[PDB]
Amino acid sequence: SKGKLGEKISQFKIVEELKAKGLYAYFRPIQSKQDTEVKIDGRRVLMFGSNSYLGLTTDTRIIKAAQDALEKYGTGCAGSRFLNGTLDIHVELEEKLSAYVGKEAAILFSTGFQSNLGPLSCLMGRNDYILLDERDHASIIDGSRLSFSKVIKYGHNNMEDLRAKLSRLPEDSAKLICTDGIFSMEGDIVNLPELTSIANEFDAAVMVDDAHSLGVIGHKGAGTASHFGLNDDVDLIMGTFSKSLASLGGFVAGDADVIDFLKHNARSVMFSASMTPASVASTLKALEIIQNEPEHIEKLWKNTDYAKAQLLDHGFDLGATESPILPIFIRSNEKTFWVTKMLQDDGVFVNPVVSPAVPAEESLIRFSLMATHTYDQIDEAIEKMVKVFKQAEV
Amino acid sequence: SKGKLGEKISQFKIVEELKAKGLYAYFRPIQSKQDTEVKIDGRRVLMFGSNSYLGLTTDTRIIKAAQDALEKYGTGCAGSRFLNGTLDIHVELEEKLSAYVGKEAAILFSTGFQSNLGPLSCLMGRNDYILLDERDHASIIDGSRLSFSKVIKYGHNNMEDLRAKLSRLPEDSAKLICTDGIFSMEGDIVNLPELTSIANEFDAAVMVDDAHSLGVIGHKGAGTASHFGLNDDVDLIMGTFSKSLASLGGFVAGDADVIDFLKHNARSVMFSASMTPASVASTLKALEIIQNEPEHIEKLWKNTDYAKAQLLDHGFDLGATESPILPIFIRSNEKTFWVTKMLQDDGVFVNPVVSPAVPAEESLIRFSLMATHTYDQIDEAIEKMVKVFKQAEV
Numbered sequence: 001s002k003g004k005l006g007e008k009i010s011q012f013k014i015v016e017e018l019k020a021k022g023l024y025a026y027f028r029p030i031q032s033k034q035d036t037e038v039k040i041d042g043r044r045v046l047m048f049g050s051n052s053y054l055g056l057t058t059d060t061r062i063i064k065a066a067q068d069a070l071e072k073y074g075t076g077c078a079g080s081r082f083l084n085g086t087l088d089i090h091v092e093l094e095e096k097l098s099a100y101v102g103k104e105a106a107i108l109f110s111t112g113f114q115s116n117l118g119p120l121s122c123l124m125g126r127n128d129y130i131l132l133d134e135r136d137h138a139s140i141i142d143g144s145r146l147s148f149s150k151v152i153k154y155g156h157n158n159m160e161d162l163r164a165k166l167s168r169l170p171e172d173s174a175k176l177i178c179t180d181g182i183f184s185m186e187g188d189i190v191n192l193p194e195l196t197s198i199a200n201e202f203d204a205a206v207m208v209d210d211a212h213s214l215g216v217i218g219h220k221g222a223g224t225a226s227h228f229g230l231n232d233d234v235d236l237i238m239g240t241f242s243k244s245l246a247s248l249g250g251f252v253a254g255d256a257d258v259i260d261f262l263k264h265n266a267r268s269v270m271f272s273a274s275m276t277p278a279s280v281a282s283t284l285k286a287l288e289i290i291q292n293e294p295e296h297i298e299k300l301w302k303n304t305d306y307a308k309a310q311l312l313d314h315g316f317d318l319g320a321t322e323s324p325i326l327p328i329f330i331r332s333n334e335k336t337f338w339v340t341k342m343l344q345d346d347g348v349f350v351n352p353v354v355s356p357a358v359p360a361e362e363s364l365i366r367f368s369l370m371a372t373h374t375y376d377q378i379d380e381a382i383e384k385m386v387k388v389f390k391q392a393e394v
Numbered sequence: 395s396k397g398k399l400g401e402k403i404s405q406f407k408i409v410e411e412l413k414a415k416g417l418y419a420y421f422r423p424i425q426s427k428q429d430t431e432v433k434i435d436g437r438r439v440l441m442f443g444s445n446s447y448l449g450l451t452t453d454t455r456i457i458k459a460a461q462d463a464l465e466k467y468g469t470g471c472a473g474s475r476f477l478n479g480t481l482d483i484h485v486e487l488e489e490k491l492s493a494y495v496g497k498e499a500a501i502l503f504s505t506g507f508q509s510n511l512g513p514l515s516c517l518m519g520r521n522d523y524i525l526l527d528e529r530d531h532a533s534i535i536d537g538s539r540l541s542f543s544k545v546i547k548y549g550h551n552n553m554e555d556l557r558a559k560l561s562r563l564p565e566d567s568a569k570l571i572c573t574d575g576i577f578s579m580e581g582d583i584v585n586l587p588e589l590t591s592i593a594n595e596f597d598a599a600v601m602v603d604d605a606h607s608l609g610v611i612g613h614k615g616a617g618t619a620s621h622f623g624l625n626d627d628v629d630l631i632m633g634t635f636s637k638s639l640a641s642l643g644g645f646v647a648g649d650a651d652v653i654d655f656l657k658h659n660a661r662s663v664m665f666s667a668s669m670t671p672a673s674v675a676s677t678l679k680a681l682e683i684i685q686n687e688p689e690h691i692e693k694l695w696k697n698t699d700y701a702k703a704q705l706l707d708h709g710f711d712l713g714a715t716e717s718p719i720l721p722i723f724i725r726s727n728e729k730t731f732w733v734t735k736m737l738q739d740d741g742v743f744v745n746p747v748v749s750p751a752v753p754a755e756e757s758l759i760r761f762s763l764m765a766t767h768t769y770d771q772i773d774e775a776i777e778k779m780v781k782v783f784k785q786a787e788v
């Protein structure tokens with residue numbers, strides 16, 4: 001029945017208002033492969049709103065590995081990994097990820113989102129604590145809500161606040177600190193050296209979400225612990241396959257005893273169907289390309305350094321990025337929606353960040369680089385951004 | 395750091411003990427396509443532990459639709475549907491599901507699990523209520539924990555307990571009842587006529603999880619509301635693609651205003667990468683086969699009726715199934731593990747249900763049918779089960 005349900009959704013008017021004003025630019029229906037240019041409404045649009053940092057979703061080798069796994073294994077496994085949904089190729093990918101991030105063992109999940117739900121829901125229980133950076137990804141907040149532990153947020157990269165909040169907790173309790181590695185909003189890196197120093201002093205477990213770090217920082221792209229030399233001080237390395245690795249799924253890697261506990265206790269792996277064969281094979285062949293062909297990471301950072309220097313030279317107000325995510329502050333929700341749509345209508349795709357996710361005065365667009373971008377495409381996007389920011393009077 | 399974390403996992407000894415006793419049969423590594431026979435350790439094993447009710451993960455048409463979508467769209471969309479991860483083919487699949495289940499609109503999710511997280515996390519809030527059948531799938535319990543509402547369980551298919559618990563709640567609050575359609579443990583069907591009668595009297599919203607119902611019950615497999623004629627009395631129809639539809643992902647269908655709210659407010663769709671192109675295309679072509687070729691549903695039910703009658707004729711103690719899930723009670727955790735491994739070692743794959751998920755005296759194996767099973771394969775599995783149950787002295 002719908003009376004009360006209709007009242008619950010009655011106040012949600014922003015989408016209706018964006019559509020009516022001709023500003024709506026969510027769920028834009030792309031008609032072609034994710035690439036540096038995409039087709040939308042039959043026209044070609046420069047893609048600066050992707051997470052495909054290495055441009056690998058179009059690599060013919062990765063496509064053919066996926067098509068070959070469909071031929072051999074079919075369209076799906078039709079069960080959880082726990083029961084009838086494990087393939088030899090899942091186990092292979094776990095072994096190859098464990099080697100890549102320097103851990104004993106790993107467990108796959110069908111999404112990156114579920115990869116955070118698993119360890120955060122089942123390791124800390126009644127009378128324990130989870131400590132979260134306040135800017136952690138939604139999946140980490142949600143995984144923490146699924147625990148029976150007390151969840152405590154600390155100020156963004158605020159090591160004194162983390163240390164003070166830990167200090168206060170009962171000694172006779174377990175604690176787990178979970179942080180993004182690269183934070184996607186502003187593209188900043190966690191202070192892993194200080195965080196791990198604090199964790200060691202309070203015997204707290206450390207879990208890093210390397211969604212935006214794998215294929216981006218660390219030796220041969222191995223992530224945030226690799227970037228800082230702190231493999232031994234991070235208990236759990238989580239990553240996703242939906243970004244540099246051009247696929248869908250994720251994993252958690254760590255000590256074999258912890259991973260054995262997770263794979264038999266995490267509801268998001270016991271009660272959800274396994275990764276498709278095609279995604280296991282695409283992730284495996286992306287992982288072998290990222291390591292064997294250093295040119296992809298190198299070109300990503302050439303593009304990042306070039307675009308960042310060009311945006312600063314034009315006087316754009318950038319956030320504190322240390323990644324291929326270039327956050328461009330606008331500081332008005334209305335202007336952020338207008339700039340986003342004006343750019344779309346001039347063939348440039350960027351992602352808006354608005355209220356209620358952030359305060360109006362912190363609203364921005366996110367301009368992300370791919371290894372496969374050209375300097376010409378970067379130049380075209382930035383000269384269109386200059387024109388739209390003028391038209392908008394930012 | 396690992397001291398307290400090592401203490402948290404220290405008491406989890408069942409896996410170690412199963413492995414040491416040679417009884418371990420989780421994460422069995424299959425080397426071939428999910429089918430009526432699978433390869434494990436190089437040998438052929440009859441598969442009676444699948445959710446692929448129509449056997450479609452091996453259909454060459456579905457494989458080629460998936461391979462063709464890889465060719466056109468690549469290995470992944472590298473973003474949430476909300477931003478850069480929508481394709482024209484996602485929108486097509488939403489329209490074709492909305493038509494199939496008789497609703498205005500649908501939103502896809504990358505997993506079935508996330509499809510329950512979305513509506514259960516974001517529709518009922520502070521001062522509202524979610525009412526859950528106590529046997530609801532883990533994803534429904536978890537999605538309810540992510541809400542800010544008060545979650546109330548009611549006794550399994552206990553309409554007097556549902557009615558009494560609703561009765562007691564403040565009139566000036568929203569309520570949402572969420573139930574499995576087919577419950578996978580025992581394969582029983584929700585009392586949707588009485589549940590919807592109660593929901594109408596208390597103006598509670600109704601959400602049905604048709605994971606095990608789509609492709610199984612309802613006209614041309616359209617699910618539990620279709621099975622009872624109660625499309626108008628169910629607000630939200632949720633389903634998965636990982637079972638009859640041979641793929642990965644899921645959806646929620648309903649009124650366009652509710653679906654528009656969900657797709658812009660459900661964290662599991664705003665903050666998780668979209669379905670791979672290959673899975674959208676496999677789901678689309680499975681959906682067209684289920685409707686156009688009635689032989690698949692018909693053969694599933696021939697196999698189900700034949701196996702059920704054969705198990706009852708041999709004197710197995712079956713649960714109250716109304717589906718192709720045949721629960722065979724053993725009522726001893728030790729015997730359930732032994733029977734499971736003895737069957738595996740004789741080339742028969744079934745799924746155990748044990749403590750702590752159920753009480754020892756309710757432990758069982760689940761024997762599920764596929765349309766593609768033959769009566770010969772059913773006969774071989776049941777004659778092996780008879781032999782193992784004797785050897786085990788059940």
Ligand SMILES: Cc1ncc(COP(=O)(O)O)c(CN[C@@H](CO)C(=O)O)c1O
Binds near residue numbers: 272510606636
């Ligand atoms: C009623 C119901 N609702 C939701 C889901 C989650 O769907 P997914 O496995 O496609 O994520 C399942 C999963 N069921 C399987 C995994 O596919 C299990 O082993 O639990 C389910 O049975």
Ligand SMILES: Cc1ncc(COP(=O)(O)O)c(CN[C@@H](CO)C(=O)O)c1O
Binds near residue numbers: 113139209212242
């Ligand atoms: C830090 C971090 N951790 C986890 C995830 C979830 O991974 P998934 O998108 O592969 O499920 C994301 C997703 N990030 C994208 C979707 O891919 C977003 O729009 O939110 C993430 O940024």
